[PDB]
Design a protein around this nucleic acid. Structure first.
Ligand SMILES: [K+]
Ligand SMILES: [Mg+2]
Ligand SMILES: [Mg+2]
Ligand SMILES: [Mg+2]
Ligand SMILES: [Mg+2]
Ligand SMILES: [Mg+2]
Ligand SMILES: [Mg+2]
Ligand SMILES: [Mg+2]
Ligand SMILES: [Mg+2]
Ligand SMILES: [Mg+2]
Ligand code: NA
Lengths: 110, 59, 194, 134, 117
RNA sequence: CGAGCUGGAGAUACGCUUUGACUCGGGGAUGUCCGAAUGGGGAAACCCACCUCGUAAGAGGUAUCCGCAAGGAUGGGAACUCAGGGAACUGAAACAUCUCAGUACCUGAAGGAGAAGAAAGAGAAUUCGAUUCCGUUAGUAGCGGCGAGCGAACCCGGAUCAGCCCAAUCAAGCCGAAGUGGCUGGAAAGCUACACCUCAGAAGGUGAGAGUCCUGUAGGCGAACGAGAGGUCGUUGUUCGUGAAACGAUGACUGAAUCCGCGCGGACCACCGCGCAAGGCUAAAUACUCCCAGUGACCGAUAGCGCAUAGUACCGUGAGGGAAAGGUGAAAAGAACCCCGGGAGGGGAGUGAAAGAGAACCUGAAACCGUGGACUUACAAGCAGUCAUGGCACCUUAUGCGUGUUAUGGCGUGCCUAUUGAAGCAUGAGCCGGCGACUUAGACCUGACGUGCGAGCUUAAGUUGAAAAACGGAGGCGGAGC
RNA sequence: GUAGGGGAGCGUUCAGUCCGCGGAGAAGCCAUACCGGAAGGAGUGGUGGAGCCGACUGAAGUGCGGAUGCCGGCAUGAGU
């Protein structure tokens, strides 16, 4: 049933890159990327917060309650932004480690 | 049928049956006078259609 | 009688067809063209043979309320179709002389309204495209009506990325259809012309 | 424009449908359903019973070249056997025949394959020469 | 290019089915029967148009000879009494008169006699 | 390649990862048993051996048919090819010939094709000059209980085009230009005011409708290194059915020459003309398609392959036959807690734009069942209506035009079919929804109409180009009939 | 006025083209007393939650009451 096959199964970011949220809800709200999933195009960011309730019927002392957890999103995020606004980065170079390339926009800070 | 191209319906300029006479030629004859000498032409205006539909093309 | 924009300036050449553009005529033409574009496609099990189904069913007399033979006839669900679509071609040959008259009259329809030509494509300056649109602007081609460029020459086409603006047509490759598809027309090259 | 483009008036009429009849039944009422071998030929209806044997030969059919085609119009292009093709007598595979039908005395030379009695006695009668293959 | 018959039969049908208003039984709820009911109905609607006249004319006639006998005549004598004299040519609506205004109809009766005997 | 991965798998636990995991490509190393199965047997996936190498485990060999050997073959393939063998229904308005048809089926063999092929030819010009395919010839010649009906070839155009040899760039992949505000909205990529790219405005995703947010697209780059004789007799083929019936082929009997030679040219003979067997091999044009890509005046699930996955459920001893079934929402935040109840199920709360989306969840027709209200009905015979009038109730196309319903009067013999004739005590039908019946092909024939040429009128195959089309005049119809 | 022949058009799907509509919401379904000579079409409301009218033209897998038709669902015989 497809799911992330529309895209090439490649995420344009990492699990520790500050990212903002454009469109949808939480406009302009930035957060640190935690869990990132290139298959289902899922993205967990400390930004979007959703108060869910874990179902624990007989785990012992269920004390069923409403825990604090995060929710995943799709391509509604602009990865890596250095001008305080959503950017794009395709330019490349190398620092001291020519085994890895980089990314930039109009500045060069990612 | 190819036995039609050699049947007495020639594709004339107009488009009718170039008939003859089937009274008597080969057999069963010997009476009358010039009944057999009737080897002339024949024509019909009610079968020209249901006859030319089989030879018209290969005129 | 259309005067060239870049290079020379004549237009008195060529003779336009009488009467002054007849709709009917173009009709027969465009239809023929679309007709040769219709690819033979037909996904139907017309035949009761192609379908996976046995030959014998119940009994003819005595089953009570049946009378059937195969379960692949059109009177049955999931079977064959009666007179379904079979793959064909539908591509005749419209008389050359009338085709020759098609575009001869097609162009005609643009000589009475939006007509434009140009010999000399130097203003282009490489691909760019951005400069290409600039050149249009200074030639009445605002970018509202659809345009068809019918010129040779690789770069000249090269700069032509846009939708409602212009269209590419390699080596004077005309249609009655393409010319009537777009509004304005740009013959440009005098290759086919005159 | 491309949507204003109409039709000939009579260039193509609508199909004929035997369904949705509201008083329509296809074909003859009986003995006409889903069979097509009766035809309209056979051999027991006039076809046979005709006294004809004849004999098929089909030898050589000559090309009828009317005499007015040479005479009347033209400035004599010299008929020969090649230039004549442009004079609307393109056939090939068969020879050429010359028959007199048009009458305007004129002096023209004729090089056909064969010709009639009346033809030859009509060309040289006004000037020319009918050349036949040796 | 296959073409389903969707949305076409239902509409066809509803069109018929909605005509059934006061129809008893399944005539008002099933198509094959409701539609069939109408055919017979058509035979009625039309013939009734032509027949209704035969009814009202007949109606008006009874009132006319009812009022006639009230005085001492009858329909055959009364209508004829208006024919003998081109004077009166009412005929139609005349029945309304013998019903609403007996006075006005009384004079017409008396006049029938004065142009008869 | 650059951060995730830990299969479809919804969940938990333990972990694998800058000493580049996984994934995507390309070669190896392991591959139990069954299966041509080949150690033997065997009712397949089981049982039993022997020999040899050996530390026991364990490993290896042991089938048959050709060969000194190397090696090769008995196997499995949807269709296509050749060969052996070879129906009937049907047609002939019956039916023995002929058709059907050398079709279906059976069997053998081979390939990514085969077949066929380098003249004892075709044919009538003292010519073309391997074979095959396409167009044409042409439906002509011809064949046929002379019936049905079957049906060439040469000439020419075109695809593709060679004759040598014996015996005496596509698969990974990377790089890859160009937007902000405001407003409606739950959510915009829309509306609005401006800006920018464009050898990239194909397309999909992203809360909705997308050039400039994402992946890609134009274009460029791109690897260790992976691909590219005669005769007789009995008969047959080719259009040829025994006809004047050649020639080729074959079973059985016979049996020639070879240079002033032999075969053939629709019995035969002379003349003339062409060619020279009894040896072989041989690219390409051609066919089909399991598989892959792309495309669509192809369906959108009662369609479409049978299957939105399944040769599964299910039926039969077996061969074999053979289904139906889709949709919560943008994303699970898919319902803590409370009330009734054993449960199911339901009601509040809450999440969400929506619960009027609640997990036997998109839309939710009809048949069928039920609740409520209005108007009516318990002395009249009713194809179930129609017309008229009255009573009552309602007034969003509509306080005056009617709607809904009813009382009564008049009138009134279901539909379809099949028929001289149907309400028919003749036929069909439980209802409803869906599905379902005059089409398609052959430059075919004929006619009406329309259109572009006009005493001329067009091309077929094909080639070169295709977001488009022209070229191609072998050929056909006009033209003289008898 | 039946078989039948002729004429003019409606509707449905797909396609090209044109003017467009749609989150304040399409198609579809549902109610209706309006309009056209018929096939039909329009306005408004309710439902629904994403796409789809009109005009011209082209192409068919194009219009159901029936065939002891086919598939599915649901009735009657009965609480028998
Ligand atoms: K509406
Ligand atoms: Mg029964
Ligand atoms: Mg019948
Ligand atoms: Mg007879
Ligand atoms: Mg087969
Ligand atoms: Mg009746
Ligand atoms: Mg009865
Ligand atoms: Mg009955
Ligand atoms: Mg009967
Ligand atoms: Mg009882
Ligand atoms: Na085989």
């Amino acid at each position: 049933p497809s799911a992330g096959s529309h895209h090439n199964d490649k995420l344009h970011f990492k699990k520790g890159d500050t990212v903002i949220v454009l469109s949808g809800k939480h406009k302009g709200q930035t957060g640190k990327v935690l869990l990132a999933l290139p298959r289902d195009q899922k993205v967990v960011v400390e930004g979007v917060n959703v108060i869910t309730k874990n179902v624990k019927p007989s785990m012992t002392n269920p004390q069923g309650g409403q825990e604090q957890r995060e929710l995943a999103l799709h391509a509604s995020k602009v990865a890596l932004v250095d001008p305080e606004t959503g950017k794009a980065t395709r330019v490349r170079k190398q620092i001291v480690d020519g085994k890895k390339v980089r990314v930039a926009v109009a500045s060069g800070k990612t | 049928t190819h036995k039609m191209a050699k049947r007495r319906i020639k594709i004339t300029g107009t488009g009718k049956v170039m008939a003859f006479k089937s009274g008597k030629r080969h057999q069963n004859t010997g009476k009358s006078g010039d009944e057999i000498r009737g080897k002339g032409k024949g024509f019909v205006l009610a079968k020209a259609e249901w006859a030319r539909m089989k030879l018209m093309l290969p005129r | 009688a259309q005067i060239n924009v870049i290079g020379q300036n004549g237009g008195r050449t060529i003779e336009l067809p009488l009467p002054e553009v007849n709709s009917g005529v173009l009709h027969e033409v465009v239809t023929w063209q679309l007709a040769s574009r219709r690819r033979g496609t037909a996904s139907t099990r017309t035949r009761a043979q192609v379908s996976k189904t046995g030959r014998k069913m119940y009994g003819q007399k005595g089953t009570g309320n049946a009378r059937h033979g195969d379960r692949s006839v059109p009177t049955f669900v999931g079977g064959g179709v009666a007179f379904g679509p079979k793959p064909r071609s539908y591509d005749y040959t419209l008389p050359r002389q009338v085709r020759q008259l098609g575009l001869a009259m097609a162009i005609a329809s643009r000589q009475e309204g939006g007509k434009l030509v140009a010999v000399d494509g130097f203003d282009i300056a490489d691909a760019k495209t951005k400069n290409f649109i600039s050149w249009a602007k200074q030639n009445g081609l605002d970018g509202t009506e659809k345009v068809l460029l019918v010129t040779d020459d690789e770069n000249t086409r090269r700069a032509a990325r846009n939708v409602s603006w212009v269209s590419v047509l390699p080596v004077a490759g005309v249609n009655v259809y393409d010319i009537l598809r777009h509004d304005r027309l740009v013959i440009d090259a005098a290759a086919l012309e005159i | 424009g491309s949507r204003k483009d109409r039709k000939r008036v009579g260039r193509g009429p609508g199909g004929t449908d035997k369904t949705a009849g509201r008083g329509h039944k296809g074909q003859k009422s009986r003995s006409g359903a889903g069979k097509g071998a009766f035809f309209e030929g056979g051999r027991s209806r006039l076809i046979a019973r005709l006294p004809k044997r004849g004999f098929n030969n089909v030898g050589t059919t000559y090309e009828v070249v009317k005499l007015s085609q040479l005479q009347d119009l033209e400035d004599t292009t010299f008929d020969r056997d090649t230039l004549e093709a442009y004079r609307l007598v393109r056939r090939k595979n068969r020879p050429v025949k010359l028959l007199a039908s048009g009458e305007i005395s004129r002096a023209v030379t004729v090089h056909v394959d064969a010709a009639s009695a009346a033809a030859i006695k009509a060309v040289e009668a006004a000037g020319g020469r009918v050349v036949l293959p040796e | 290019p296959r073409a389903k018959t969707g949305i076409v039969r239902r509409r066809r049908h509803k069109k018929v089915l909605k005509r059934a208003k006061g129809f008893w039984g399944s005539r008002s709820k099933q198509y094959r029967n409701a539609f069939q009911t109408l055919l017979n109905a058509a035979t009625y609607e039309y013939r009734d148009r032509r027949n209704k006249k035969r009814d009202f004319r007949r109606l008006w006639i009874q009132r006319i000879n009812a009022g006639a006998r009230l005085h001492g005549m009858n329909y055959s004598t009364f209508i004829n009494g208006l024919k003998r004299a081109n004077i009166d040519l009412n005929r139609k609506v005349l029945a309304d008169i013998a019903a609403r205004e007996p006075e006005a109809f009384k004079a017409l009766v008396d006049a029938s006699r004065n142009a008869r005997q």
